[PDB]
Every structure is written in structure tokens, then in C-alpha cells.
Amino acid sequence: FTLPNLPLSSLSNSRAPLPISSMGISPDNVQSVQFQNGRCTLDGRLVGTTPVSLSHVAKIRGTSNGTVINLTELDGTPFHPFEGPAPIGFPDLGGCDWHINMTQFGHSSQTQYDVDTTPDTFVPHLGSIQANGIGSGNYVGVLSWISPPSHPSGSQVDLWKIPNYGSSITEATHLAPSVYPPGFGEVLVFFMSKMPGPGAYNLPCLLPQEYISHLASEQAPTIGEAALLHYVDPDTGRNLGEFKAYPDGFLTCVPNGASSGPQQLPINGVFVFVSWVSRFYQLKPV
Amino acid sequence: FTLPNLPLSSLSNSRAPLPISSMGISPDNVQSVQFQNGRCTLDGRLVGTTPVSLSHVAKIRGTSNGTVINLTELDGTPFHPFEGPAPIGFPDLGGCDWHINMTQFGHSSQTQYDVDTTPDTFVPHLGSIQANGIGSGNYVGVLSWISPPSHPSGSQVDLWKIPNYGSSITEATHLAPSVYPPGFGEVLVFFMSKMPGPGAYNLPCLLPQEYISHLASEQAPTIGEAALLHYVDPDTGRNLGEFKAYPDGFLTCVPNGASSGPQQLPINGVFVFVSWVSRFYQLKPVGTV
Ligand SMILES: [Ca+2]
Ligand SMILES: [Ca+2]
Ligand SMILES: [Mg+2]
Ligand SMILES: [Mg+2]
């Protein structure tokens, strides 16, 4: 079994096309997460709206009639509700307004599309989102920058969230399931990127995008209960700490206190597969 | 030795963050190319301005003073002329004007930056390009759409070119070397994408970006003279054509006449390494035997 032999700081977020700038843990008011992009199992099964390639990540495609944008897949193929919560690659950033840069094949210019994901017109699961002033035509859009949610008024930017893909929060949209910390002092490890916009925004994901294409390619036939990893300095070969990767596609570690965890590690290290271990294998704290 | 076990249509161009839509050959007024992005050897050596990750591709970072933009690497690290023709990831699309979407950490809004790459103020090799109206501040920019070049006036978009990175076409900028068709009836194979803007623009590259991260990770210790590959349909397992990958990081095939080449192949196939062969190994024309 292998992970990419590439330093983390050379890789991309899997929730937006942004370089990885650090590792992190979630705030204390965040336990589980339910990201729809950046989801890939260790045997290579893509989950949620996750694409193989960053060229599809945090993008939309569709035709505006001036009132709504009717969505398709990025290549123009129809999207149907049975397929998922939104087309492949659709942004999954809850807890913010989006600003998507819209361009066209065969026309000049770009246009900023401002997206509040809270109203009942925002129903990408049914292939329809409000045009919010975007004129008639076919567009490809990519997330450019974010800002605080328009509703509820005065809400914080909270990128641990996903948007409401359905007409209401009660509508089933075929979300990929939530990921939970597995217990025994282990915390989920997130790969962070700086996101432009009027604040110090940091976007977490479960796996760098290049890990997803690697795992989707490798299609490992021999996944065990947990992969014991070392986070290694490439030059010195020094083991900077023990981590576990779980079959559902996430990493954990045991921090060495609130002041010393994966966020204190250099970001130019490489994760290296050591061996398959028990689900309950007890890690040495970072 | 391995290449990604992923269909081409799931992958990205390495000169802009765009899905791969086809394979193609060069125009008959292009024999060699000298792309600076999308360059990686089979043993994993990145060449030119090529980054590992698509998150750096066709991007700029720098500080405008209202007159010029002083460039750095995307992470803010200094860039110096000895390092290359431009910072890592900098766009390499010749034969067009660029329209780059500029955003800022800690600020609202985006701004379109319009770039004619022809004037003597466009000197990314020396870390400086004209601001062309972009206000003071630090920005990250990503290529968004392109249009015909402002100079020479009336010329067509030609993405087979690279821009002039120096103050003059005679200035040495440490460009990655040209790639030439190798002989034996073989043609260079390009991976194509559609680029937004006011025309039917076709962006070629030598390798999908995911192949570059794959090769850079793999760091193959045993590269031969050429890799013999099959282009395979995953479901049926059918061999749709023999190709060669050369150490410098490019693929070739032998077209089955003017009528039948890479452009006629479906784009949902997978390249699979077969064996190391001699540089002079003669391929069967695509689709034949
Ligand atoms: Ca698995
Ligand atoms: Ca110039
Ligand atoms: Mg790694
Ligand atoms: Mg392939």
C-alpha cells in the first residue's frame, strides 16, 4: 500500500483549488464532519461529489434563464437527483456565501456570481439554483472567494459545515455519510488552505486532492483495519510522528497536549505507509 | 513502472485547470513545442515552471504598486531570475492575451487583470509585469479566460506558443528545452482542453497534471530508452493503440494515415505500461493489427 511520496505543502485542498498551508484539528464545537468533496476510501472508492481531478473541484456548470441556473455535470452531461446531492465537484462549503467566477466557451468576459446557499431556491440536488442576476447563457463557474453567510444575519464563517443541497434540511439528498473521531484520544486530522475573502479564512479537508487521485489509481487490493503511518522529514528521514489512516479515508493522531498537535508540525513532510494495524492500535502522541 | 490507472477524461490539462477533452497532434505549422508547464520526466524530474499540483497551475502571486506587479512564488517565497523564466506555475500560454482573476487574502472582491505578454514591461523572468490598472496590494491570480493577442494586431489565438518571459526575445530566461518529434513515423501526442474566451480555443499539453504528480511521487528508479504503452478500454480490456513514452516526458504514436490518429480515439481510455523498449522500437499504426 502507498500514499503519494510528495510533501504536503506541494499538494492541494480537495474542497477548493488551493495549496495546502497547514494541518489542523477541528474546533471544540465540531465533532463529526460531512464534507462531500475530498472523500475517497483507502481502496480508491470516490464518495459524495468528489472528482478524481482538481480541475473539477468547487466548480459548477449550467444554463441561466435569468431566474434560475439549471445545472449539468461539468462536461454538459445531464445531472439527475438519484446521482447525488449535487453534480460532481459542486462546492461543498457550508457556513458562507460563495463568489463564483463565471466564464463561457465562445464568449468574452467573466462575471461574479454571488451565492447564498440558504434560500429555498438553492436546490442543486434537484439541479436548480437561483441565478441572482446572472444573465441568460451557459457558464462554467469556479469558486473564487467567500464571505460571511447572508443568513442567518451576523453568522460566522464556518467551513466545517456543508450547504443545504435540498429544498429543506429534511429532504434526502444522498449525502456521503459523516466522519467521526474514532475514540481513544485520537482526533481527526485536516489539511488546511487559506481561502480569499474579507477574513482569515481557513478551509479544512480530509485528504489532499493528489491523495484522492493516487488512491483512485492504486485501487489497493489489501486494505487492513488501519494503516499506521509516519510523517517523515524527507531530507533527514526523521519520523516526526505516528498517524493512522482509516479505510473510510481519513487520518488521525493523538496530540501531545492542546498546545502541541499536528498544527505544530512542519508542513513539508511526507506521510509514509508503515504497516496495517488493529483499529485499536494505540498511537504515540505527536 | 506505472502510469495512473485513471481514464484520460477524468484528468486535467497541465497548462490550465481544465478537464481533458481529447488527444490530438500538433498543427502542421508546428513541429516542436517548448511548453514550460506540464513538463515532467518519466523518473519524476519537474522541468520548466511545472508544479506538482494543479493548485499552482496558471497562477500568479505578487504585489502591485499601481504601475508594476512584483512577483513572488505562490506561497510568497522570493523569486529570483536564476530560478527560471518565471515563478513556478506562472502561465505559459503564448499567442494570446490573458485575463487573470485576482483575489486577496483578507479582502473582499475579485478583479480581472488583462495581460498582453508582448510589451517590454512584461518581464516575469525578472519578477516584474505591468500592473495595467491593478491597484496597489498583494494578489493571487488564476487564469480565467483568454482572447487574441493585442500584438501583432489581428493575429489568431495560438496556444502552441509560449510567451516572451524576458525583456527581449534574445534575453536568456532558462527555458525548459524544446520537445521534438523523435522520428520513425512517430507524432507527438497532446492532451487537449477547451479554454473559455471568444473563440473555440484548444489548449494542448504534453501530460495530464495527474500524470505529473504520479511520476513525481513514483520517482521510478529503472527508466529504459522508451516505455511501450497500450491505450486500453477499461471495460473490454481492448488495446486501442501502441504508444511510446520517452524519458523526457512525452508520448508518441504512429497515425494510421491522415484519416486516423489520436484525435479519433475515445478519451475514456487508460494508458498502461507494457515494457521498456529501444528508442528505435517501431510502433504499429494506431488501431492496426
Ligand atoms: Ca477502503
Ligand atoms: Ca515580454
Ligand atoms: Mg505525502
Ligand atoms: Mg491513464
Curated annotation (Swiss-Prot), chain A:
Q: Report residue spans for region: P1 sub-domain 2.
A: 176-286
The segments labelled P1 sub-domain 1 in the record are 1-48
Region (P2 sub-domain) residue ranges read 49-175
List where the protein spans the membrane.
none
Q: Where is this region: Protruding domain?
A: 1-286
This protein's superkingdom?
A: Viruses
Role, per record: The soluble capsid protein may play a role in viral immunoevasion.
Supply the name of the protein.
Soluble capsid protein
Organism from which the protein derives: Norovirus (strain Human/NoV/United States/Norwalk/1968/GI) (Hu/NV/NV/1968/US)
Organism lineage string: Viruses, Riboviria, Orthornavirae, Pisuviricota, Pisoniviricetes
Curated annotation (Swiss-Prot), chain B:
Query: Where are the annotated segments for P2 sub-domain?
Result: 49-175
Positions of region (P1 sub-domain 1): 1-48
Q: Which residues form a coiled coil?
A: none
The organism's superkingdom is given as Viruses
Positions of region (Protruding domain): 1-289
Functional description taken from the UniProt entry:
The soluble capsid protein may play a role in viral immunoevasion.
Name of the protein described by the UniProt record:
Soluble capsid protein
Organism (species) = Norovirus (strain Human/NoV/United States/Norwalk/1968/GI)
* Shown part of the complete sequence: 231 to 519 of 530
